[PDB]
Amino acid sequence: FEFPEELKTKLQEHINYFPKKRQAILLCLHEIQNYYGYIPPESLKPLADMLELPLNHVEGVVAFYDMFDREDKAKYRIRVCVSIVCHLMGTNKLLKALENILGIKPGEVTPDGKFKIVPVQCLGACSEAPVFMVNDDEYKFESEVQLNEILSRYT
Amino acid sequence: EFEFPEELKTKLQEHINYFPKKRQAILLCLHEIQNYYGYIPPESLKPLADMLELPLNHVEGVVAFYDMFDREDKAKYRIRVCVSIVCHLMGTNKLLKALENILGIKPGEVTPDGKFKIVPVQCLGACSEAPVFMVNDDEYKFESEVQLNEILSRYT
Amino acid sequence: SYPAIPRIYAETTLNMLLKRAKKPRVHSIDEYLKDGGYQALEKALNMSPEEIIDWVDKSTLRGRGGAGFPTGKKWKFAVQNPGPRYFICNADESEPGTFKDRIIIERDPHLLIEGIIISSYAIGANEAYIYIRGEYPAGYYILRDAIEEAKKKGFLGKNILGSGFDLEIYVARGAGAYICGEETALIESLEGKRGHPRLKPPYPVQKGLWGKPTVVNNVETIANVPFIISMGWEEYRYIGPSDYAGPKLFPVSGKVKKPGVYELPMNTTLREVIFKYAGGTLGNKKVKAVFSGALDCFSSEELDIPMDYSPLGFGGTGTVIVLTEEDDIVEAALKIAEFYEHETCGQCTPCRVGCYEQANLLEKIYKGEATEQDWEGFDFVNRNIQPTSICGLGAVAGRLIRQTLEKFPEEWEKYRK
Amino acid sequence: RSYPAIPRIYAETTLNMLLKRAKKPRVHSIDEYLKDGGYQALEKALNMSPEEIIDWVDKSTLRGRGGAGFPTGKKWKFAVQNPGPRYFICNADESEPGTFKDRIIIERDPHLLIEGIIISSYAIGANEAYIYIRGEYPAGYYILRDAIEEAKKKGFLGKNILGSGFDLEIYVARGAGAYICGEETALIESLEGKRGHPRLKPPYPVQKGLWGKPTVVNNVETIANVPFIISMGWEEYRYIGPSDYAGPKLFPVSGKVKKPGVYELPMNTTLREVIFKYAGGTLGNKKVKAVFSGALDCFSSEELDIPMDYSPLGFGGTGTVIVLTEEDDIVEAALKIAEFYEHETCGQCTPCRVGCYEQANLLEKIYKGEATEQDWEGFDFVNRNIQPTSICGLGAVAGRLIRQTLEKFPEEWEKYR
Ligand SMILES: CC(=O)C1=CN([C@@H]2O[C@H](COP(=O)(O)OP(=O)(O)OC[C@H]3O[C@@H](n4cnc5c(N)ncnc54)[C@H](O)[C@@H]3O)[C@@H](O)[C@H]2O)C=CC1
Ligand SMILES: CC(=O)C1=CN([C@@H]2O[C@H](COP(=O)(O)OP(=O)(O)OC[C@H]3O[C@@H](n4cnc5c(N)ncnc54)[C@H](O)[C@@H]3O)[C@@H](O)[C@H]2O)C=CC1
Ligand SMILES: Cc1cc2c(cc1C)N(C[C@H](O)[C@H](O)[C@H](O)COP(=O)(O)O)c1[nH]c(=O)[nH]c(=O)c1N2
Ligand SMILES: Cc1cc2c(cc1C)N(C[C@H](O)[C@H](O)[C@H](O)COP(=O)(O)O)c1[nH]c(=O)[nH]c(=O)c1N2
Ligand code: SF4
Ligand code: SF4
Ligand code: FES
Ligand code: FES
Ligand code: NA
Ligand code: NA
Ligand code: NA
Ligand code: NA
Ligand code: NA
Ligand code: NA
Ligand code: NA
Ligand code: NA
Ligand code: NA
């Protein structure tokens, strides 16, 4: 396995950004996940070499940090907050609306690999509960009609 | 000399700062003045002109033009009675009669206590609810004298 | 807390403009957002202004303020002129029998606001106005509060939703003049002056507020804009007849069982408005006439016309004041004359003297104190209000009354004897 | 410059300091920051000795806004007694439930934070500084990267800043989903490219931090105060609020209030005032049952009259106000707090590892009505025994709020027994 040159260039920028290469590990893993829609297991050995770190170190880090997903490829990650404020204000309504539109529940991917619902802890937008993200974009859920229109923006 | 009380002057300054140009606030200011005093005091116009950076005769002409402003009669509550086509068809005269029975005044007149003035006005844009009147900013369908009496009892 | 407003009945077959405003209460931004509100704006900001103009043009949207001028075409005229440009929402609604615009303002203010934002973007205006008549104080407080809600949610201010588009909406109040709904008098009032109409041309789109390109559009017109963007122009054009497409509001008053505002397609006939929707006449009396505000008088022989902007259509504001068989047409004509007497701005001599004399003499006729000369004078004056007039008031101050003279000669004759 | 979508959190200020710009929900770039007099505090700072800056920050009575309220000046003094090089770290990991105060500074007024970081770095003699921002704030990350570049171009970062001989680079690191990485020592481990495992304290970072060197870690909101202290002087700063607990404070208010959002207020404000005077009262005007101070404390409705300060009887914490009303099931809410700690224990310490897990696992059984008598007794035991041997604050408090609900709402718990 080998990184495409456009991605490798991007990883090199991160590695060169901080004073020490190993500081770039999380920026690198975000970049990888952005590129592939998940963390390819085969990507870690080459990344470890670029960071001048042992492979097991890199594996331990991927395992520790909940945002990284080595299991499921998805184009769009719908992160749904399931913490206290969103729960009080209507996480379950958002989840039901998502099941109506997409036919999936938290932890599942659509068969086309387009959407995965990820249950997450407080997203720091609790005044706008219930909160969800679609990749980097963040939104307040208002209603199913509203949600349907938002999701239609992601092709 | 006449000066605006600070509570009024403050509100006038908000309006004047609201639009991009000071002079655009002229009607909002005059509404505010009439709200405070129960009419437009003639003496108020020169200070307002100064605040708007307009000539006095400009302000005077604007007050004269706009029918909502009243330089003659102080009144705590203006009972605006619609006298246009739909309200006329549906019972303006019944409403005027009820008002005369309760308050003892006709259109154009003020009660002796200065509390109520009846103001005949053109179509108020609530014609489905004819006959229509306002009491200051509140607006109502007239149903009957007993009902009108209850409405007016809320203005003290 | 807002001033008391009468609870005007509202009914819709289309569920668009009156989707929320059929319920007589303020719908605030959260309720608006629950119904998908402001998603049309988000869509619009991802389109070019030129595209938005194109969609509004192809929709067939015509001016709902009464003249029916094609809206997209108005916008195109504006944008061919150098900026800055201004966008004005005309909420002066003061035509007799007309209460269609206030129910949007007072019940679903965000529909209007969303429309203003999209329209302003379309024509490149960074400053917009609502001019609301002074006798709508509640509408004013509701709009001010709604605009602050829109600011809170980032739909107004600088760099709206990262688009680079900036907009402020200012709310101005009228203070008693019908003429300030005439678009050029409205502009004079926004500039801090008396409401005196300007000679046209130029039209506002060439020379308006502070002499810059300015679009004036009616409340109802603007309320259509979110639907055009949300549905697309083709889907919008499926509503009603393809040549006069979209929802229309019809304020119905007078001698009907169910007076109120009806949202209906424009292929609806006048007879259907009265009998199918507004519940027929009070006491099931016969229709004598319908006043289209203070503009036209239709007789009972003219009820099968479409409520559209065609030459043979009802046109105007869609305002339907129903008179029945026992209503005296001369008494009704007097009220129309009194209206115009009260509202001429006086700049033009035949309008000034003609509106006054028409009312003065018709009162004499009505009271049976008219001389033969007063009769002949009334006829002459009625025919001579229009010459030299620089705005539509003088053009039409004799129109409805003349139509009653032609359509109800027997009633008038009773007065001439 | 296009950024990911951010919901438009409402923000309101009585003091016009931290939220002078951030009360408007958009990015304020360097030109707007400069127009408001920004970066003049830095210039003034660079004409001062580090020693004097520390003195001012000490005399301001500024306390850590990350939640513990440690005196900031004292923290800095401790660092500078140790030989360099030294490092400065801005903690932007903000992941406590209910807590969204820091992001509005980052996303709307980044230069306020940047200016604070430069002054603070100069004060402690750090030439290398970091912002560690949680991974779930991607917009904040890009906004900060862009602002740093703006600052560089205007000569506020780099070598020999404004001819002072002071050098600074600010690096922006991202988290990747671990609440624990907000704990200052786990944050440092993460910056060093490792798992976010907290270290035994003491030593505190000011003695031994990043690469073993003296390191000051301060919260976003703490740092954002620094430009004001320099701009106005410490005397003037102390005139804000009560003289013991001086300065502006941000209060993120969520849950069952009419106006959820961030409020900038002085710390003599009561909790009752926050909810009722500022946040508009409760949804549906329902009675307040409890306030959760993030995931740390539970206040009952008998404890609303407390000051929002760092006093022993005060609200304390981060200022986070999650409101629950009379219908909200306290056991259901406790389960959500238990689930949070279950998901975030790093697992180094055995009672924390097993305790956070079992607390959640058993409370779910209790909630679902499937708990045995031994499950109930086990729950009580585990809740009281998460803390022993813990080396960071998570283990120390993972049972705290839940225990408070057990003591303050026994009626409701007993119903589940
Ligand atoms: C709703 C309400 O309370 C009232 C409504 N009206 C209505 O006002 C209408 C007359 O309005 P106006 O005199 O503005 O009509 P118009 O036909 O001269 O112009 C209509 C619109 O199209 C524009 N327009 C017309 N010709 C144009 C041209 N050549 N180029 C650019 N714009 C043009 C013009 O600027 C205006 O906005 C009547 O039909 C009434 O129904 C009158 C009084 C009160
Ligand atoms: C904002 C947010 O998302 C979260 C905030 N928190 C808050 O974190 C707080 C606990 O933090 P910590 O365990 O760091 O508190 P502490 O009291 O041990 O120390 C606070 C600061 O003072 C320094 N400090 C304390 N004693 C010191 C000493 N003797 N010498 C030097 N520095 C000292 C210490 O290094 C840290 O920076 C709680 O009150 C929570 O409110 C927790 C989780 C998430
Ligand atoms: C005397 C008089 C009074 C008014 C008008 C005309 C005249 C002659 N017009 C029509 C106005 O000038 C203009 O045509 C419309 O506002 C344009 O908007 P639309 O193209 O209809 O959307 C008008 N329009 C409106 O929207 N509200 C109003 O209250 C009035 N009042
Ligand atoms: C589990 C856990 C999690 C966090 C913290 C603590 C603990 C125990 N702390 C507090 C942090 O360790 C430290 O006290 C502050 O960052 C110090 O800065 P101030 O003195 O508040 O300016 C903390 N602080 C902060 O600024 N942001 C955060 O996201 C967190 N998260
Ligand atoms: S036609 Fe009549 S209302 Fe219009 S400008 Fe002339 S005088 Fe004024
Ligand atoms: S107390 Fe808990 S979170 Fe803190 S270091 Fe120990 S196991 Fe990790
Ligand atoms: S609890 Fe969902 S964003 Fe905070
Ligand atoms: S005629 Fe009276 S409100 Fe219209
Ligand atoms: Na270094
Ligand atoms: Na979950
Ligand atoms: Na301007
Ligand atoms: Na009215
Ligand atoms: Na209404
Ligand atoms: Na604005
Ligand atoms: Na009038
Ligand atoms: Na300023
Ligand atoms: Na520069």
UniProtKB/Swiss-Prot annotation, chain A:
Catalytic class of the enzyme: translocase
GO biological process, one term: respiratory electron transport chain
Chain positions recorded as [2Fe-2S] cluster binding sites: 81, 86, 122, 126
Pfam family, one: 2Fe-2S_thioredx
Known catalytic reactions: a quinone + NADH + 5 H(+)(in) = a quinol + NAD(+) + 4 H(+)(out)
Bound cofactor: record note: Binds 1 [2Fe-2S] cluster.
Molecular function, one GO term: 2 iron, 2 sulfur cluster binding
Domain of life, source organism: Bacteria
InterPro entries for the chain: NuoE-like, NuoE_dom, NuoE_N, Thioredoxin-like_sf
Entry EC number(s): 7.1.1.-
Cofactor: [2Fe-2S] cluster
Keyword Metal-binding: yes
Keywords: 2Fe-2S, Iron, Iron-sulfur, Metal-binding, NAD, Quinone, Translocase
Family the entry assigns: Belongs to the complex I 24 kDa subunit family.
Biological role: NDH-1 shuttles electrons from NADH, via FMN and iron-sulfur (Fe-S) centers, to quinones in the respiratory chain. Couples the redox reaction to proton translocation (for every two electrons transferred, four hydrogen ions are translocated across the cytoplasmic membrane), and thus conserves the redox energy in a proton gradient.
Protein name: NADH-quinone oxidoreductase subunit E
Record lineage: Bacteria, Pseudomonadati, Aquificota, Aquificia, Aquificales
UniProtKB/Swiss-Prot annotation, chain D:
Annotated GO MF terms: 4 iron, 4 sulfur cluster binding; FMN binding; metal ion binding; NADH dehydrogenase (ubiquinone) activity; quinone binding
Cofactor note: Binds 1 FMN.
Sorted UniProt keywords: 4Fe-4S, Flavoprotein, FMN, Iron, Iron-sulfur, Metal-binding, NAD, Quinone, Translocase
Catalytic activity: a quinone + NADH + 5 H(+)(in) = a quinol + NAD(+) + 4 H(+)(out)
Enzyme Commission number(s) of this protein: 7.1.1.-
Binding site for FMN: 175-222
Function: NDH-1 shuttles electrons from NADH, via FMN and iron-sulfur (Fe-S) centers, to quinones in the respiratory chain. Couples the redox reaction to proton translocation (for every two electrons transferred, four hydrogen ions are translocated across the cytoplasmic membrane), and thus conserves the redox energy in a proton gradient.
Name listed for the protein in its UniProt record: NADH-quinone oxidoreductase subunit F
Species assigned in the record: Aquifex aeolicus (strain VF5)
Gene: nuoF
